[PDB]
Amino acid sequence: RGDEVRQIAPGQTGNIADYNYKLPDDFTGCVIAWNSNKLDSKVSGNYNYL
Amino acid sequence: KHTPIIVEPERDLPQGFSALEPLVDLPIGINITRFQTLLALH
Amino acid sequence: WNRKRISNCVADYSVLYNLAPFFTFKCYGVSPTKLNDLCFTNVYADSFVI
């Protein structure tokens, strides 16, 4: 979800970072993100992402 | 601070030393610029 | 002015983070994600429209 793409950053703490996927302290690399409603949204809602 | 004082001269403070301790802190948080005393009358 | 002296509480900022509608979040003096590791003598909460 868009509003918490800010959460995924080195040294940050959040629910996704706490329980799903977090970067190491000494990480080096790159991060890219963009809109995906045109390809992933669905009338009446999707259910394939959990 | 509270104290009992007895002294012969009048209209003058008792020379010496005193101290105060913290009693109350309040979160009121308001711009106060004036104040007034409160007396008991009969 | 509607300052609230919140007392007799656990500062469960976890559920506050789980709260969905509130979008923008920032802190000054401390890192934004450290609210869960803090104790306060008093809690001063104010609500406005900006």
Side-chain angles (χ1 to χ4, degrees), chain B residues 25-29, chain C residues 1 3 5 42 44:
Chain B
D25 187 6
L26 299 169
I28 56 173
Chain C
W1 200 259
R3 180 147 275 208
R5 187 184 203 184
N42 301 280
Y44 299 166

Side-chain angles (χ1 to χ4, degrees), chain C residues 26-32 34 38:
Chain C
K26 186 182 286 185
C27 291
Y28 293 87
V30 303
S31 177
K34 305 305 190 180
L38 309 185

Side-chain angles (χ1 to χ4, degrees), chain C residues 20-42:
Chain C
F22 270 68
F23 301 129
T24 55
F25 171 86
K26 186 182 286 185
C27 291
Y28 293 87
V30 303
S31 177
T33 61
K34 305 305 190 180
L35 272 187
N36 291 274
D37 305 356
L38 309 185
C39 284
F40 314 122
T41 67
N42 301 280

